[PDB]
Design a protein around this nucleic acid. Structure first.
Lengths: 132, 380, 62
RNA sequence: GGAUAACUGGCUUGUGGCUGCCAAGCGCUCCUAGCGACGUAGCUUUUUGAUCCUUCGAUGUCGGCUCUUCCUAUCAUUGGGACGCAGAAGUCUCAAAGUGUCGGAUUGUUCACCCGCUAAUAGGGAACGUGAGCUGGGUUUAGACCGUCGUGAGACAGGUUAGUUUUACCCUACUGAUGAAUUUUAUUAUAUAUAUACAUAUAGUAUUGUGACAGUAAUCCAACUUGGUACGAGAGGAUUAGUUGGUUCAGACAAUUGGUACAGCAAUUGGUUGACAAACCAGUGUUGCGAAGCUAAGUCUGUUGGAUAAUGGCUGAACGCCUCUUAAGCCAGAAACCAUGCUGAUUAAACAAUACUAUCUUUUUUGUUUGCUAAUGUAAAAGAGAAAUUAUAUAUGUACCGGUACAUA
RNA sequence: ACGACUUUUUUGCCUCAGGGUGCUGUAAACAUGAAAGUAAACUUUACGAUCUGUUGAGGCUUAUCCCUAGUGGUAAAGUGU
């Protein structure tokens, strides 16, 4: 697997509450950190589709709650420029929880999933109901 | 004591003093180095920034995330009517730098060239450049031989034809262009042969080339520290305002440290953009100049209703990748790169798929006057 | 020759102008203009409005 | 009242912090790969003292924020040396300050203590960096509260709540903006294969430029391919390049997306002009769209030579052999250094070339013993005289073919 | 900011106007039009938010939009050397 992602628009600062989008039993995901983030006094860490977050579970099954978990962003409200020549956007924001090497907790991603993140992660492409 | 947290300074220190540029024209600070091996040729060209469009291009890069998939990319358009050559300059190397030996002029020159030397051409009797134009051919020969004997650098005095532009000004823009390739004798023959003639941009530059762009930036007036240098605003609480300055500090030394960012001019700075790729060189002669093989309808680079503040692009033109320093209507100087470029992007051959000509006066909902007529049909 | 339609209307959409919205049910909706986008954003029946091509067709003036 | 505390500074550096030397042990065997007791020598002021020299007719008393600069005692990044360095790790270390050094939780807080990312989340200086920069939460005015202590008034480097943070229009500084003036001053050439400073140089506009000098900038990560290879007993598992991407900092730009409205069309609430259209009024009445101009959360672009350091070597003595040279002679070799590049250059009271021009220019003679309308100045005259050239532990001619021969100082 | 800068001053330029490009969203007006009902005749005549037609209409679009030598204009005559 090649881990290339291309530039996708900045979105979702830490503390954001997003949909979990799978049968994991998490209903929402509260993002507490980004993996691989830069260093800077001015900045606050922000997410995008191609990036690995760390989250906690506010709503969902009791085993998942309060524990820290890795997640991948799958849907985002903030528009980005696709190189097909249009600015694409979802209505809502959603990610799916994973382990830190990117293995799914869930098994079927209920919404559609963006192509640039899907073609990034096999285990998401497998599970995804539609590729955007 | 040491700072609580570490961050570099806001903005480059290397562009202080961040004052107004001395001269309007995009003066070349240094020429590409001469190569004796190469055939004689011009190193630079002046053109006028007409506006921006985007272009659609087919891509290379096996192993890329995007790969060969065609892309839409921003580009600038630079109007490039032929410059006219009027003089030969001979420069000599000394320990105290390059010094002019002599200047040789053409027998015939434009009025627009002379108009630049006058301040008030309208009220003048217009004596300037009227006697010495008629100097003997023997004198010209002696001067050329004198230049051949001693000089190690040859430059040609070229000027714009301003009347080809749609601009209000009629005073020509005049500029020296160093001649690179051959030795001095071959350069002299090349300039002498060229002399009175007009030089298309396509004479100097070929499609796919990488070019250096010299221009003064867009003026904004004298600005505060936030605007000029990008410092973080002071907290909501602040008694004398959020945009109040950075704290200068230091009791000893007992002076302001010049490296502090501070209020003063924003824009109107001299700048060299480097390594901009030529995506297309258009030609006035081509009736299908902004048309493509993919979309064959009649298009010249001029948008639907023309460019905002520039209208019709009158003559031949450079379609250059991305952003260019300064305003539309501004003269822009194109220069060859200081060293030849062996990069992938330099080597690559552009294949354009589409050039937009939609309106930028409006929200560009339509592309051509024919298309608009066909779309609407009946009208009063 | 052509690429695709302008979504409020039949005529050709040129690349680099448009935007795309994917809705909650996963249908994609292609917008030419900010004006068309605001009507969609406000979730209104655009076909009711006099100016639009659907209205012109429906009222038999195409 | 600095004849005397609390503050910087200062002396000192006990104490704190850092580096040593030694060699009894530890380090499987082994003093020194790594260590290092029992000792003994320094360095620093990044701690706190000791102190009371300075300031008591007022140097604003903590912390945070913001913001910049400097150091190195290097945490990571580059090049390396050593290893108890199999690989992979990793450790000690040298040239190194080129470059970076974060998001939060809790605190009045330096400090502290966690969680997360990370390339590492190094340590310090700048009046304990930074109150006519802010903030005023804490210590530290007067109200009030509880506890202890005090007969009491009251006390408490005990806890707690509440409590006005004054002035720049001066000079400089620095940031940007103009701008004359400049012969004790200049000149790197000028003139037709030969001349020439004991000589040239008015000025006024304008263009082309020169470029001393001053400034300077780009940066790190990931993945894959190399390669599941070398190495390894296996488990594992690469120094390296190559390719594609992204981060950070920078410089622009606005086509195009988004953001933006007292350009501008439409809608509508209350009131007013008989209705009507038309309008007006509500400090922008209020909505929807909103070109344009700005702008980012958007887009583009962001060099390579030289001389080197550490270090590895080479030839090679001192010393018959040997030796990288702390003899001569050399060589390769780093994010360091200087150019290149790029910015400024009334930072050089700097300058060149070109174009056109101001009743005006040239030679000789006499003079220069309403503010003005003939008019004088020399830091150097007195023979102001003076053409090799590498050297200089040897040169220069001339003849031969950089070398040989022969002369000459 | 103001200086300063970019300019042009009759093969131009300004000024409006026309045309282009747009932006808004279908004007006023009229209908021997329709319309929830209303009242007044024994299916017609009065009244009626509204909607449709004539009608992608009407408006606005250079000030720092575009084109046009299309209209009319295009002065002081001052000052330093």
């Amino acid at each position: 697997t090649l881990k290339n992602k291309m530039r996708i628009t900045l979105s979702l600062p830490v503390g954001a509450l997003i949909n979990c989008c799978d049968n994991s039993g998490g209903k929402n995901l509260y993002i507490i950190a980004v993996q691989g983030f830069g260093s800077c006094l001015n900045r606050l860490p922000a997410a995008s589709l191609g990036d690995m977050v760390l989250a906690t579970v506010k709503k969902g099954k009791p085993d998942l709650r309060k524990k820290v978990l890795n997640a991948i962003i799958c849907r985002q409200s903030k528009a980005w420029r696709r190189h097909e020549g249009y600015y694409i956007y979802f209505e809502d924001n959603a990610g799916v929880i994973v382990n830190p090497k990117g293995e799914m907790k869930g098994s079927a991603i209920t919404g559609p999933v963006a192509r640039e993140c899907a073609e990034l992660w096999p285990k998401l492409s497998s599970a995804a109901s539609a590729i955007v | 004591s040491h700072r609580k947290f570490e961050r570099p300074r806001h903005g480059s220190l290397g562009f202080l003093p961040r004052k107004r540029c001395k001269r309007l024209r995009g003066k070349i600070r240094s020429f590409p180095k001469d190569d004796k091996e190469k055939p004689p040729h011009f190193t630079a060209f002046m053109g006028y920034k007409a506006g921006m469009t985007h272009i659609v291009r087919e891509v290379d890069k096996p192993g890329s995330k995007l790969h060969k998939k065609e892309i839409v990319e921003a580009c600038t358009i630079i109007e490039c009517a032929p410059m006219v050559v009027v003089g030969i300059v001979g420069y000599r190397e000394t320990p105290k730098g390059l010094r002019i030996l002599s200047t040789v002029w053409a027998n015939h020159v434009s009025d627009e060239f002379r108009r630049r030397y006058y301040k008030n051409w309208y009220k003048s009797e217009k004596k300037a450049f009227t006697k010495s134009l008629n100097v003997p051919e023997a004198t010209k020969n002696c001067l050329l031989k004198r230049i051949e004997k001693y000089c190690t650098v040859l430059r040609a005095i070229c000027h714009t034809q301003p009347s080809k532009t749609p601009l209000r000004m009629k005073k020509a823009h005049i500029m020296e262009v160093q001649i690179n390739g051959g030795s001095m004798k071959e350069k002299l023959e090349f300039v002498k042969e060229m002399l009175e003639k007009n030089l298309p941009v396509s004479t100097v530059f070929n499609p796919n080339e990488m070019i250096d762009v010299i221009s003064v930036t867009k003026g904004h007036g004298t600005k505060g520290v936030v605007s000029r240098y990008g410092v973080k605003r002071l907290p909501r609480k602040t008694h004398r305002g959020l945009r109040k300055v950075a704290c200068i500090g230091a009791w000893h030394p007992a002076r302001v440290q010049f490296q502090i960012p501070r209020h003063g001019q924003k824009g109107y700075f001299h700048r060299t953009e480097r390594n901009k790729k030529i995506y297309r060189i258009g030609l006035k002669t081509d009736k299908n100049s902004a048309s493509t093989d993919a979309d064959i309808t009649e298009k010249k680079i001029t948008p639907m209703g023309g460019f905002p503040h520039y209208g019709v692009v009158n003559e031949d033109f450079l379609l250059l990748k991305g952003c260019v320093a300064g305003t539309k209507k501004r003269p822009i100087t194109l220069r060859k790169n200081i060293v030849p470029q062996v990069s992938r992007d330099a080597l690559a051959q552009v294949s354009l798929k589409f050039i937009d000509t939609s309106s930028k006066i409006g929200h560009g909902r339509f592309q051509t006057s024919e298309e608009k007529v066909k779309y609407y049909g009946p009208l009063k | 020759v052509k690429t695709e339609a302008c979504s409020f209307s039949e005529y050709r959409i040129y690349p680099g102008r448009g935007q795309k919205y994917i809705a909650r049910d996963g249908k994609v909706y292609f917008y030419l203009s900010s004006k068309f986008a605001s009507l969609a954003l406000q979730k209104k029946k655009a076909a009711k409005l006099r100016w639009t091509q659907t209205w012109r067709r429906n009222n038999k003036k195409t």
